Amino acid sequence: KLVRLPGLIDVHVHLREPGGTHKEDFASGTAAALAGGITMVCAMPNTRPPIIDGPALALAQKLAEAGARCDFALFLGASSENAGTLGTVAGSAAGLKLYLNETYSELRLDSVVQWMEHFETWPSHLPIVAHAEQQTVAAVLMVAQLTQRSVHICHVARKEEILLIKAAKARGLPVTCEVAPHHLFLSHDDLERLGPGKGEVRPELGSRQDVEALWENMAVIDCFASDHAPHTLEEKCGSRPPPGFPGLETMLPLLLTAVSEGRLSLDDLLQRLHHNPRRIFHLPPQEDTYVEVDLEHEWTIPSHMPFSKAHWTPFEGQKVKGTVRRVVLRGEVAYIDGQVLVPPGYGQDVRKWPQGAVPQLP
Amino acid sequence: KLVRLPGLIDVHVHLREPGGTHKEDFASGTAAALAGGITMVCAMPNTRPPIIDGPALALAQKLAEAGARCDFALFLGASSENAGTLGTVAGSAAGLKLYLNETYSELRLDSVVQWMEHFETWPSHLPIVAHAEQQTVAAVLMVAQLTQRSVHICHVARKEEILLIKAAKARGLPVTCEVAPHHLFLSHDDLERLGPGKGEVRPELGSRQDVEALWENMAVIDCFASDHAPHTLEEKCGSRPPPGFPGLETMLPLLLTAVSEGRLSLDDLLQRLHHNPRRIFHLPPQEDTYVEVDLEHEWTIPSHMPFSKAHWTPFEGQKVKGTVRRVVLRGEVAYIDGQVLVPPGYGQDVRKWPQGAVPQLP
Numbered sequence: 247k248l249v250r251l252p253g254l255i256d257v258h259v260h261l262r263e264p265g266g267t268h269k270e271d272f273a274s275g276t277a278a279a280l281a282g283g284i285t286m287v288c289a290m291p292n293t294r295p296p297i298i299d300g301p302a303l304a305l306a307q308k309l310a311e312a313g314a315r316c317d318f319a320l321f322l323g324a325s326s327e328n329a330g331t332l333g334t335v336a337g338s339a340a341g342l343k344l345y346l347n348e349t350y351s352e353l354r355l356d357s358v359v360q361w362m363e364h365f366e367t368w369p370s371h372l373p374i375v376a377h378a379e380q381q382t383v384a385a386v387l388m389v390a391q392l393t394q395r396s397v398h399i400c401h402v403a404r405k406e407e408i409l410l411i412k413a414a415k416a417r418g419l420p421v422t423c424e425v426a427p428h429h430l431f432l433s434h435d436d437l438e439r440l441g442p443g444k445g446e447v448r449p450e451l452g453s454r455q456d457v458e459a460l461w462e463n464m465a466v467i468d469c470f471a472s473d474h475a476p477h478t479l480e481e482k483c484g485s486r487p488p489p490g491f492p493g494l495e496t497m498l499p500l501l502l503t504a505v506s507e508g509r510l511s512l513d514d515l516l517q518r519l520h521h522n523p524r525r526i527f528h529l530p531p532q533e534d535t536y537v538e539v540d541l542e543h544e545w546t547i548p549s550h551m552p553f554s555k556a557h558w559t560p561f562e563g564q565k566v567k568g569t570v571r572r573v574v575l576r577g578e579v580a581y582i583d584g585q586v587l588v589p590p591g592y593g594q595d596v597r598k599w600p601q602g603a604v605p606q607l608p
Numbered sequence: 609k610l611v612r613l614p615g616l617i618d619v620h621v622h623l624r625e626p627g628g629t630h631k632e633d634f635a636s637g638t639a640a641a642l643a644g645g646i647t648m649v650c651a652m653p654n655t656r657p658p659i660i661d662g663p664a665l666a667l668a669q670k671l672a673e674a675g676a677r678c679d680f681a682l683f684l685g686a687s688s689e690n691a692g693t694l695g696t697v698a699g700s701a702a703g704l705k706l707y708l709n710e711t712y713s714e715l716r717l718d719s720v721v722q723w724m725e726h727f728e729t730w731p732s733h734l735p736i737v738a739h740a741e742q743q744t745v746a747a748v749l750m751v752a753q754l755t756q757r758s759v760h761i762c763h764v765a766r767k768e769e770i771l772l773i774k775a776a777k778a779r780g781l782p783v784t785c786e787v788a789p790h791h792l793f794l795s796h797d798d799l800e801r802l803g804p805g806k807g808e809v810r811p812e813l814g815s816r817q818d819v820e821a822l823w824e825n826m827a828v829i830d831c832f833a834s835d836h837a838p839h840t841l842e843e844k845c846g847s848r849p850p851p852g853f854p855g856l857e858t859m860l861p862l863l864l865t866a867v868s869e870g871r872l873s874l875d876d877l878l879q880r881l882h883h884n885p886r887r888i889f890h891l892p893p894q895e896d897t898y899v900e901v902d903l904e905h906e907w908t909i910p911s912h913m914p915f916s917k918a919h920w921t922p923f924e925g926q927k928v929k930g931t932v933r934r935v936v937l938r939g940e941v942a943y944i945d946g947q948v949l950v951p952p953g954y955g956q957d958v959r960k961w962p963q964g965a966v967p968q969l970p
């Protein structure tokens with residue numbers, strides 16, 4: 247007896263195209279998404295070239311339209327030079343991404359004044375998401391208040407961060423956040439097994455107390471999002487390991503295991519992988535789209551999942567209960583039992599759908 | 609220049625059919641909904657007979673399918689005799705409604721133990737909404753905690769209530785709530801003009817301090833819902849006035865006025881009339897459905913709106929800015945400039961759509 251879920255949405259993926267296609271491309275990363283029960287992804291802008299201007303966005307849109315197998319929206323990235331220049335294309339993007347700490351990106355902003363300039367110039371009705379760790383969460387929240395608008399905090403990983411966000415919500419501030427599966431299901435206790443290269447990720451893996459604080463504060467978490475950040479094993483095991491984990495294929499099985507164990511409900515999961523992504527990012531419904539999962543099947547995560555070109559996973563060896571059996575996307579069978587059955591280019595840019603534009607005052 | 613909105617959802621309407629059809633019926637109340645920019649309604653069970661058992665629900669479903677002009681879901685009502693009997697039909701309903709205070713209903717429960725029995729027997733994945741005023745909000749929240757599930761509080765009207773809910777959310781408790789327009793736009797200051805009959809409503813109109821507390825605590829309000837509660841002028845002005853106001857045709861114009869004045873944003877409005885209703889009640893998307901509004905048109909609310917059979921309104925004389933120009937429902941023009949253009953029976957029970965069933969574990 248399968249369970250039918252709506253089309254799930256991952257608001258934080260790195261699909262590496264253009265410029266890092268040995269790590270992943272639109273076709274492989276969206277195959278991974280479909281196999282993970284994800285029918286819509288929002289792709290981050292830290293590509294090569296980065297998606298920081300209109301020509302780069304135009305290129306990325308065409309590469310995604312030609313390669314994506316599921317539907318998508320593309321983020322724009324904030325840079326030290328593009329505030330005030332994105333107004334014509336802003337509404338065609340998922341939102342604006344700010345990189346406020348060291349990570350796999352060349353887009354770090356060097357002054358809080360640059361953050362303010364982005365918050366002041368980006369259209370006020372459109373999403374802003376921030377990579378903001380530890381005190382940076384408080385700092386970007388201050389900038390959001392000074393500019394009288396909302397912000398969404400990416401990949402929250404620490405007790406410190408979730409409690410700060412909790413305090414902000416208690417004061418009625420317009421802040422939302424997401425948590426990635428590695429920060430719910432891995433911790434410092436796993437660094438022995440992973441090693442220092444594979445274990446590299448931003449935010450870094452937390453303590454057991456960090457993990458327990460995220461679970462205890464599930465009510466504060468608006469979304470789950472994978473932060474699918476594929477890099478090859480050679481890169482992760484080499485001299486200058488880039489941070490990041492692949493995660494599209496493992497996110498839903500990990501979370502279904504937690505549902506089966508009573509750690510959160512099916513509804514809690516669907517709020518965080520469907521309804522809240524829709525409402526925060528104004529992402530449209532997908533007609534005739536659903537995911538069928540088998541909640542009884544027990545399996546062990548292998549050394550690599552079938553689709554991501556990362557060809558490794560930090561969850562290797564974990565026992566899960568729950569698997570994706572079938573995905574239907576817009577009336578077509580997109581995935582069955584290990585086979586993706588829609589070609590590259592089946593996926594569409596949801597921001598071009600009439601129902602996918604963000605509503606605004608004239 | 610019109611603004612396109614998605615199909616708005618009102619999770620709290622009284623359509624009076626069966627048994628009170630001089631006040632409203634499915635055809636007239638859903639005409640009123642469409643003229644108010646509402647494309648989906650959830651109808652309350654305090655009809656005659658009340659929707660408290662499977663035969664009554666079956667009758668109401670057929671009357672709604674034959675009369676509704678917009679889409680709908682029907683609540684079941686909790687009674688002193690039906691706990692443990694609704695399991696076969698529960699998933700076909702919008703949710704379960706509990707009447708916990710005196711109001712226009714014969715369904716009051718006489719003991720908190722009866723509330724517990726409903727929370728224990730109603731399927732745990734399906735919505736429960738409560739009419740719960742003042743301390744009753746705290747009482748039903750306790751019952752929800754004892755039974756380890758969520759609750760949604762109808763028509764919050766008082767500083768006391770919104771602050772209690774705020775405190776509960778700060779403790780991470782699974783509670784949501786809605787506020788009706790009369791509790792945002794009318795107060796004791798209006799009882800002089802309304803008189804004691806017309807002014808009768810449950811919860812009663814609040815003080816200016818109550819109104820100001822609801823606005824100040826907008827972040828705590830998950831949904832707006834009209835509590836459209838039509839009664840004729842003869843009834844409202846007679847010896848034993850029933851409580852309630854009609855409100856479908858005035859809700860969106862009142863709230864658009866507030867948006868135009870900067871009291872809340874367009875997004876704040878759409879979270880509360882679209883996204884949060886969807887996610888709390890698991891209501892499906894409506895394909896090819898949207899509402900076009902004109903935000904510049906200033907008008908004065910007349911002594912009665914065109915469609916509701918209530919034929920009166922407590923908002924008479926208020927100046928508003930914002931009007932519904934066109935509604936498209938599932939690919940058909942449903943309303944233009946004062947004319948409803950879909951017939952009775954165009955509307956459908958969304959709980960029968962594949963995408964409208966509430967997901968559950970097997």
Ligand SMILES: NC(=O)N[C@@H](CC(=O)O)C(=O)O
Binds near residue numbers: 447476488490
């Ligand atoms: N999280 C990571 O460790 N890496 C991400 C970048 C990011 O989300 O910051 C990547 O693009 O590789």
Ligand SMILES: NC(=O)N[C@@H](CC(=O)O)C(=O)O
Binds near residue numbers: 739809
């Ligand atoms: N609110 C009211 O004053 N009346 C409502 C009942 C209700 O919502 O309690 C009605 O059905 O007339």
Ligand SMILES: [Zn+2]
Binds near residue numbers: 349448449
């Ligand atoms: Zn990041």
Ligand SMILES: [Zn+2]
Binds near residue numbers: 399401471
């Ligand atoms: Zn993110």
Ligand SMILES: [Zn+2]
Binds near residue numbers: 258259260290473475
């Ligand atoms: Zn990332």
Ligand SMILES: [Zn+2]
Binds near residue numbers: 525528878883
């Ligand atoms: Zn939206």
Ligand SMILES: [Zn+2]
Binds near residue numbers: 711739762810811
């Ligand atoms: Zn009520």
Ligand SMILES: [Zn+2]
Binds near residue numbers: 619620737762763786
């Ligand atoms: Zn209600």
Ligand SMILES: [Zn+2]
Binds near residue numbers: 620621622652835837
């Ligand atoms: Zn009511």
Ligand SMILES: [Zn+2]
Binds near residue numbers: 886887891
């Ligand atoms: Zn749902």
